[PDB]
Design a protein around this motif. Structure first.
Motif, short mmCIF file in Angstrom:
data_model
loop_
_atom_site.label_atom_id
_atom_site.label_comp_id
_atom_site.label_asym_id
_atom_site.label_seq_id
_atom_site.Cartn_x
_atom_site.Cartn_y
_atom_site.Cartn_z
N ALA A 1 20.07 13.83 16.56
CA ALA A 1 21.51 13.91 17.40
C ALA A 1 22.10 15.25 17.59
O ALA A 1 22.91 15.83 18.05
N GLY B 1 14.61 5.50 4.42
CA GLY B 1 15.94 5.47 4.61
C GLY B 1 16.60 6.90 4.98
O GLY B 1 17.29 7.27 5.90
N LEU C 1 5.07 12.27 -3.83
CA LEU C 1 4.08 11.36 -3.30
C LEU C 1 2.70 12.02 -3.66
O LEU C 1 2.45 12.80 -3.13
N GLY C 2 1.90 11.36 -4.59
CA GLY C 2 0.68 11.65 -4.83
C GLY C 2 -0.57 10.95 -4.04
O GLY C 2 -0.20 10.48 -3.02
N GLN C 3 -1.60 10.64 -4.95
CA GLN C 3 -2.50 9.85 -4.52
C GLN C 3 -2.02 8.26 -4.71
O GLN C 3 -2.33 7.39 -3.63
N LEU D 1 17.26 11.17 12.27
CA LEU D 1 18.49 10.79 13.43
C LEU D 1 19.48 11.61 13.29
O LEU D 1 20.11 12.06 14.61
N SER E 1 17.49 8.73 8.39
CA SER E 1 18.80 9.28 8.50
C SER E 1 18.82 10.86 8.77
O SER E 1 19.51 11.28 9.39
N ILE F 1 9.47 14.98 12.42
CA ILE F 1 9.29 14.87 13.96
C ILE F 1 10.64 14.53 14.65
O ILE F 1 10.52 15.28 15.88
N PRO G 1 0.74 -1.31 -0.24
CA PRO G 1 -0.04 -0.15 0.18
C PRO G 1 0.86 1.21 0.03
O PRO G 1 0.72 2.18 -1.07
N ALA H 1 7.68 11.64 7.96
CA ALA H 1 7.00 11.97 9.22
C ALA H 1 8.13 12.02 10.32
O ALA H 1 8.06 12.83 11.15
N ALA I 1 5.59 7.37 4.07
CA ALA I 1 5.00 8.52 4.93
C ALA I 1 5.98 8.33 6.25
O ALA I 1 6.06 9.26 7.11
N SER J 1 11.99 18.17 14.56
CA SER J 1 11.17 19.11 15.30
C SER J 1 11.43 18.72 17.08
O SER J 1 11.25 19.67 17.70
N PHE K 1 11.42 2.79 0.77
CA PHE K 1 12.59 2.16 1.48
C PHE K 1 13.68 3.32 1.37
O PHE K 1 14.25 3.39 2.43
#
Lengths: 43, 150, 213, 114, 31, 57, 150, 148, 148, 149, 150, 150, 150
Positions: free
Chosen positions: L95, L84, L70-72, L91, L88, L14, L2, L10, L6, L17, L80
């Motif tokens: 860090a 990744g 990325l669309g519909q 992180l 990265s 995330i 599917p 995210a 995301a 922030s 992947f």
């Protein structure tokens, strides 16, 4: 900030209330309560 | 069949032996002498080790009866009904061994100074040791219908 | 299979958080993984009607490396509390605390104990030590080597940990002046027989998994 | 317009705050550029990349709500125009662009890089 | 609704030229 | 169709934001009508019915 | 046949024996701590351990009643009923024993400090068994439909 | 095929144990070196002795990495995990014991010049645990070619 | 195809170890500079030493990113996780040892000026694990070949 | 399925645990306040009786949920009763957890001054709406569980 | 179908009841502690318990409204919006009750010494109610889209 | 599959922030606590919060660049390299923020006693801020190959 | 398709409401203590509670915007893009609220003693809106690309 004519924030009086007023008729109660403060400014 | 139910006999004496070991461990800890001698409460403090070991001694009969009722081959019907009696005696033996361990530690530390608390402390472990007998009775009643399986 | 890549990542992730637990605070173990695995195992165990069980055959790997790694990892950690106490004495006494280094050899014997069984646990092969359930039968000999090497490794690690704990208290052996360290060494010498008796009883009880043609 | 449900008033309320804030940003840059009066410099060169990106996004946003017939865009337009721009130089339109049509991104990137 | 006053006081004060504009807006109508 | 034509016709065709001002406080009163007329032109009712689809979804 | 309701018999006696052991340990700690100052309230304070120990009879009778209602075949209408019915009385006896232990410790220390607290501590400890009685009634009502496996 | 994490676990565990042992030996050497500056060369032996354990995990990781990418099967991917875990746990335990042993040897050598020979003898004798795991990893990695 | 987590794990672990080493060096840097304000350029070597280990994971992730094609089998996405995890663990252990070695070298070098060679020697010697794990990850990444 | 018995049985266990913790905290506060003056022990016993009334909602909801059980066990009858019983159980446990701190704070503060009995009795009497809300949600969820196959 | 959509309706009342219970306990602790030292602020300090206790009506109305939209015959894709809106309303009610508890305890403790901070404590305490209204409005908007399918 | 793209997009913003929020909180805590003792050092101590807050632009621009492709409908090859590069960048930003926070708090606290280490703290923050830029550059290089398909 | 995309829209309001509740509780805890020393500083110190609670509008607007986009039918690729925006905005608002709580409490405690530090405390807390605005813009850009037809 003791300038005589500029700059002291003269654009904040127009940009401040116009941009701040866009976050809100809900403004009728603020216009009535703000209009009561004109007569109630002295006392 | 999967032959599930043999772990119930071995799991019976685990919580009982852990409860009795926590009872004798929690009862043996603490100071028992005041200056140079004691009130002869060393003979009174030997009752908590036998009271903690009585739950494991009563729990061993449930594992012996479950081990004798297990056999070499058994179906899933008798094996499913046979498993479960050891955990009831194990949990009650572990809880009664923990309460007998705390009651033996407080009754041993307070019993070192004055032996007047041995009347209530001796009846507390006797009133708390009934969980292993009730769990062994429920394990015997559950194991009574698991014999002769097909 | 997924059990190889899952058991390898779980074994590396368990030793990573377990090794980082006693170290400086940079990473912590997942405390929610025990309740999530217990709720997921108890939820899928009851529903539906089925018996949950994993079914490998031998897996061929963890016995020889797990025995020598478990024995060397347990034997290598015992000399820390003993060497810190023996060197921690200092110039307080010229007594037997500098002549009691025979316990370090007993803790050093836990590295060979289990590694010799791992050396004897592979005869003329390194991928498979016996018959496996991929082209033949009788995979119980290769299956029992993991539990035999894990039991011998855990027994050698516990005997080396007990020997190191007895050596750390056997380093000084006295809280005041005019004390003897032979009484702590007498009780410390009795804990070294658990590695030899546990390794002989563990290796003899596990049989053999070598000589696979 | 009117608020009846979601996904309808947000297409105009989204570009309304950017179109209203663009005049305040341009007036705020012209107000700072007019001040500080021989002693000129450091203000005429600034506000060129944001004026080109925000000018091309506000121009496609204002032109997007006037495009019915089909030469327009539902996703958004405006947001997808400035979002797709600055990533590919040799593009044509994405989406609802006028007959220009690839010199705006080249002049915007060339004027923004200098 | 003070986010417009915070953003106009912080971000708007850099390109134009603190709490001097809020006091200057009320003091502007007085004088 | 758009409100930009009515805002440009009203603001750009009414006074042009000029030119006389008072002799006292001509800065705030002069620059206030330009920003107020600019915001009032920005509130020109530019809502849907050019690309609108009501009752979504 | 397949069955999983065998743990419901020991699940009530495990939590009931653990809560009764924790309440008996918490009552024996306050009785042992209050027995050092005043040795007159030891025999009066010994009644709360026997009063707290009566919660295990509901889990034992519910476990014997749940084990007695087991036939020779396992269906989908009997399994999973004794686990919730015995687990409700086990959790109610565990919460009643947990509140009875904290009420017995503060009632024993406060009763040892000042008199007239045995009526309030015995009133709250006697009134804390309503959750175990309601859990035993719900365990009996849930255990009443555990038979007739189709 | 999951021998890559087992091959990297030797250098990961050996680098973590050598990093912690070099951190504790550098902290104890730096703390004991403030008193007397002559004991710096005597106290510097534990960091160099602890840092030499990475060569066994690097050579075992190179030898295990040499047998990956050209030939592999189901039975030829299990020895690298135990071989890397043995040298990783032996290097981590040897570095962790070498850190406290280097700190206690640095304090004993900082007190007087008597326990420095014993701490140097214990630190020189602590390499047998890593040498046994390196020999077991080389012996297990050497027999990784039976069929195919 | 899930080998991107192994490529991002090298820069993630090296960035976390370099961040923890820069935090550990900056913690003792203010305490060492608070006593004497002359040493201001002799204590920043652990920050550059911990930050120099990020080039191994950055060059490993940048070199491993170029070997990504449209089609790839499951054999080419297993060694990259172990090589990247080993390089990230080696850089994290080298940065974590370089942080305590830098703070202990700055605290020991703050009192006596002769202890700077030991702190620079331990911090310069503790970076071998990132080069060993980066070399093992480079050899494992270079030895990985598979299509379909 | 056939696993709704633990969810139907846990509703009385949650309110029994919250009422047990409320009676424990009320007995601890009454035991701590009875040491200074043994003249207000009967006034401080209102918190245990007020906290113990929350168990009747989970007991009646558990008896009403147990009475609606049919003769078969499927996946449609073991999901609504678990959330309906768990809702009243968690609401009774939260109401008992708040009634324990309210009764402990009122019993502890009632020793120095008994003027706060109206406010503590008002907050303790007003904090019982969670059991009625969870019981009404359990009855509303139990009302849509008919026709169990 | 599974028919597991009741977890979203139970989690909203569970999180709202837990947040309202923690807020009522935290407000009643500071109100009961501040009521002894100052009886004049008794009527003023009662606003925090009434303001904190109103968070339960959002989760109860969201669970009652989500209970009617479940249907007699459940589907597989039906229990998603009720679970997300119920979890969001539960987390919003728990965060609103958790902030209202510390705001009520800090408002009562700070208002106990000086009564000049009653306007700031009343405005700061009344300002945290937007989270439960936003989560209840999001749960109502998600509940409105959960009645068209099936 | 599917979709799996995301999670990295995210987790990048995330983690960036969260690291910038933790560094801004840790710098603002020591800056606000040390600002009372020295009023002249308030302008110097505020550099760490503003310098730490600029780290979110890398994860925001990387999340916007990954979200723009990325669309519909999308394939599984982007989910992947996107996860990744987002992991990265996340992180690296976490860090960088976590390494910047302790140095900003220790620098702001140590700057009050001796005002000579400001260049060392500014060079330490400027040298520690490149760790998020390296992960943002690796996320841009990995994100450049995620736009070929779809 | 399952149509389980409601968890991504509902995931934002829990972390945003929890972060705004923790920041409003952290500012309200120090506001009542700082208002006792100076009555004029109450209105100046009351801005951090609204500044911490103002971050809930991003998660509420993202959840309200993503709530109407669900409908009844969904695709297999719909439901993953909103989870990154919801989790990113939730974690960014929760970390920004958590740092804004301690930064608002330390800024209120430091600004309570000296009134000159209120401009630095407000200026330091004013820069925290960029993380929630960037996460809300990334969540809006991710939510805008999820629905492309109708």
């Amino acid at each position: 900030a003791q300038y005589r004519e500029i700059n002291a924030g003269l654009p904040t009086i127009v940009t401040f209330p116009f941009m701040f007023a866009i976050m809100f008729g809900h403004g009728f109660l603020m216009t009535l309560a703000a209009l009561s403060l004109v007569l109630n400014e002295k006392k | 069949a999967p032959f599930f139910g043999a772990i119930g006999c071995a799991s019976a004496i685990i919580f009982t032996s852990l409860g009795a070991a926590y009872g004798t461990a929690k009862s043996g800890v603490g100071i028992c002498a005041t200056c140079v001698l004691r009130p002869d409460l060393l003979f009174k403090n030997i009752v908590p080790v036998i009271m903690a070991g009585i739950i494991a001694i009563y729990g061993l009969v449930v594992s012996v009866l479950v081990c004798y009722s297990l056999g070499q081959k058994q179906a899933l019907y008798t094996g499913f009904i046979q498993l479960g009696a050891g955990l009831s005696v194990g949990l009650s033996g572990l809880a009664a061994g923990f309460a007998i361990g705390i009651v033996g530690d407080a009754g041993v530390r307070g019993s070192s100074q004055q032996p007047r608390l041995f009347v209530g402390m001796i009846l507390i472990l006797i009133f708390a040791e009934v969980l292993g007998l009730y769990g062994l009775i429920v394990a015997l009643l559950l194991n009574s219908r698991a014999t002769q399986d097909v | 299979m997924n059990k190889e890549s899952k058991d390898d990542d779980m074994s590396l992730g368990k030793f990573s958080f377990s090794h980082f637990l006693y170290y400086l605070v940079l990473i912590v173990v997942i405390v929610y993984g025990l309740y999530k695995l217990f709720t997921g195992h108890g939820s899928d165990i009851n529903f539906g009607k089925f018996l949950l069980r994993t079914s490998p055959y031998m897996w061929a790997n963890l016995g020889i490396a797990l025995c020598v790694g478990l024995s060397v990892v347990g034997a290598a950690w015992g000399i820390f509390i003993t060497g810190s106490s023996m060197i921690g004495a200092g110039v307080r006494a010229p007594r037997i605390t500098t002549k009691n280094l025979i316990s370090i050899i007993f803790c050093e014997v836990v590295a060979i104990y289990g590694l010799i069984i791992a050396i004897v646990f592979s005869s003329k092969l390194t991928v498979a030590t016996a018959e496996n359930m991929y082209s033949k039968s009788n995979l119980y000999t290769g299956y029992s080597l993991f539990w035999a090497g894990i039991t011998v490794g855990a027994s050698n690690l516990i005997c080396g940990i007990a020997v190191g704990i007895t050596g750390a208290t056997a380093a000084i052996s006295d809280a005041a002046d005019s004390a003897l360290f032979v009484k702590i060494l007498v009780i410390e010498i009795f804990g070294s027989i658990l590695g030899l008796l546990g390794l002989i009883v563990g290796l003899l009880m596990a049989g053999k998994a070598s000589e696979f043609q | 317009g009117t608020e009846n449900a979601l996904l309808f008033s947000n297409s105009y309320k989204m570009k309304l705050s950017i179109l209203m804030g663009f005049i305040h940003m341009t007036y705020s840059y012209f107000f700072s550029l007019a001040n500080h009066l021989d002693i000129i410099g450091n203000f005429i060169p600034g506000l060129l990349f944001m004026q080109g990106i925000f000018g091309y996004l506000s121009v496609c946003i204002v032109y997007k709500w006037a495009v019915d017939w089909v030469k327009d865009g539902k996703p958004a337009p405006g947001l997808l125009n400035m979002l797709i721009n600055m990533f590919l130089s040799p593009g044509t339109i994405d989406d609802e662009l006028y007959p220009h049509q690839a010199k705006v991104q080249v002049f915007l990137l060339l004027m923004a890089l200098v | 609704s003070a986010m417009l006053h915070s953003l106009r006081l912080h971000w708007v004060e850099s390109m134009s030229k603190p709490y001097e504009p809020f006091a200057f807006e009320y003091k502007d109508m007085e004088v | 169709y758009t409100v930009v034509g009515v805002f440009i016709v009203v603001s750009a065709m009414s006074v042009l934001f000029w030119i006389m001002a008072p002799k006292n406080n001509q800065a705030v009163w002069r620059s206030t009508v330009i920003l107020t007329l600019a915001m009032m032109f920005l509130m020109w009712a530019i809502t849907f019915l050019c690309q609108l689809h009501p009752l979504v979804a």
